[PDB]
Amino acid sequence: GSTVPRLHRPSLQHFREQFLVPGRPVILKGVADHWPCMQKWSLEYIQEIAGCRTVPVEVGSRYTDEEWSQTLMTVNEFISKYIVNEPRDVGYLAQHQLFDQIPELKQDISIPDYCSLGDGEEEEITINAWFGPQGTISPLHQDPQQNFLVQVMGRKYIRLYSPQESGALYPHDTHLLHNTSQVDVENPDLEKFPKFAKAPFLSCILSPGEILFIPVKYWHYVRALDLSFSVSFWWS
Ligand SMILES: O=C(O)CCC(=O)C(=O)O
Ligand code: NI
């Protein structure tokens, strides 16, 4: 593959014509790099502002695992058990609308201006938190809206496959998981999934301050390389 291109504060028009309309990924630089979250969100700050609130936590290496489960605990409990104290299992505070739950945190982020190029209402943009230790993995899957994934703490390795390559990604046949690949991107079973090997892709390491544009229906796979906090904006 090649690396996702990085662009510094492209104009709305450039973003619209070269990335949004054709559905091409890009990393936006110089857009979120000075949001307050970038300097402010330490573990300690997260504990102070959110520690006592209940959050959903995914436990297990990948959501496609058979032993994978979902539970509830306080943010303080999550940090203690799954981040700081030699964790026994992988825990991920994933896909959670933390900013609706805790409006004060919402002050530390913004809606990217590029979202106004969409046809949807700003109020209907879904903002999710993704907070977890090094080693969290989100299996290869596609989503039904455009996405800006903003990296705040730590880095993520991300692999992207175009919707045109769906055949080689062997989606699950169950209507429920049909937007998830059967393939483990970083250790694929080529005896069972031979078409996967030659499928072209883009990749990147997404670092703090950077925004990855994931076009609607683009397949994406994500592994945290460090203690990580990302904020996703699902928009149309
Ligand atoms: O960061 C991750 O682990 C996955 C994020 C994702 O799938 C999304 O923002 O739609
Ligand atoms: Ni996703």
Structure tokens belonging to residue 134 = 């090094």
172 is in an annotated binding site: no
Structure resolution, Å = 1.6
- Domain assignments of the chain as residue spans, ordered by start: 1-236
CA 147, CA 108: separation in Å to the nearest integer? 19
CA 220, CA 14: separation in Å to the nearest integer? 23
**Selecting from 3.40.50.2000, 2.30.110.10, 1.10.645.10, 2.60.120.650, what CATH number does the domain 1-236 have?**
2.60.120.650
195 is in an annotated binding site: no
Give the method of determination. Answer: X-ray
Mutation test of ligand 1: which of 90, 95, 142 has the most ligand atoms closer than 8 Å to its C-beta? 95
Residue 111 has phi, psi (to 5 degrees) of: -80, 125
Q: What share of the chain is helix, strand, coil (3-state, %, to 5)?
A: 25, 35, 40
CA 145, CA 85: separation in Å to the nearest integer? 36
* Tokens 């499928």, residue located: 199
Q: DSSP string of 160-178?
A: EE-GGGGGGG-B-SSTTTT
Shortest CA distance to 160 belongs to which of 94, 232, 222?
A: 222
Cβ–ligand 1 distance for 149 under 6 Å, the answer yes
161 is in an annotated binding site: no
C-alpha 40 – ligand 2 centre gap (Å): 25
Contact criterion met (CB below 8 Å) for 202 and 160: yes
C-alpha 105 – ligand 1 centre gap (Å): 19
